[PDB]
Amino acid sequence: MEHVAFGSEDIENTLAKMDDGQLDGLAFGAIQLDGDGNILQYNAAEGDITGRDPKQVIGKNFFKDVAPCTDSPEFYGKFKEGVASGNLNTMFEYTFDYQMTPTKVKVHMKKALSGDSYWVFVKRV
Numbered sequence: 001m002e003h004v005a006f007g008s009e010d011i012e013n014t015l016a017k018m019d020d021g022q023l024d025g026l027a028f029g030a031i032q033l034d035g036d037g038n039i040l041q042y043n044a045a046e047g048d049i050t051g052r053d054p055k056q057v058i059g060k061n062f063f064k065d066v067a068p069c070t071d072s073p074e075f076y077g078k079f080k081e082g083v084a085s086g087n088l089n090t091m092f093e094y095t096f097d098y099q100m101t102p103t104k105v106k107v108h109m110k111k112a113l114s115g116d117s118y119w120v121f122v123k124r125v
């Protein structure tokens with residue numbers, strides 16, 4: 001288990017040194033999106049929550065194909081705004097319900113230390 005807490009203020013610095021292998025050790029879901037919403041990373045933990053096979057969704061558009069239930073002003077709206085503005089740090093509850101049992105979750109989104117990469121952290125509530 002990779003000892004990193006959900007909601008840590010310096011999470012993006014800590015996660016900068018993790019490979020996909022290390023990323024699977026987190027106690028929470030972690031997805032890495034590019035500026036266009038394509039999945040660059042998607043760890044085992046999130047997969048436990050959504051049922052998705054991590055290595056299968058990589059390279060696919062999240063908002064378009066993986067998780068259409070996040071295609072809303074309440075989720076997709078903030079991401080694109082964050083991307084545009086060049087910064088993002090927001091926390092809010094949500095419910096994933098596409099092709100799965102409705103699961104109330106907490107979502108944390110924040111720009112990565114990298115230029116055009118963005119994190120989506122997910123935990124059960």
Ligand SMILES: *C(=O)/C=C\c1ccc(O)cc1
Binds near residue numbers: 050066070097
């Ligand atoms: C809403 O988000 C529904 C499903 C879903 C699919 C994939 C991932 O990663 C999260 C949620």
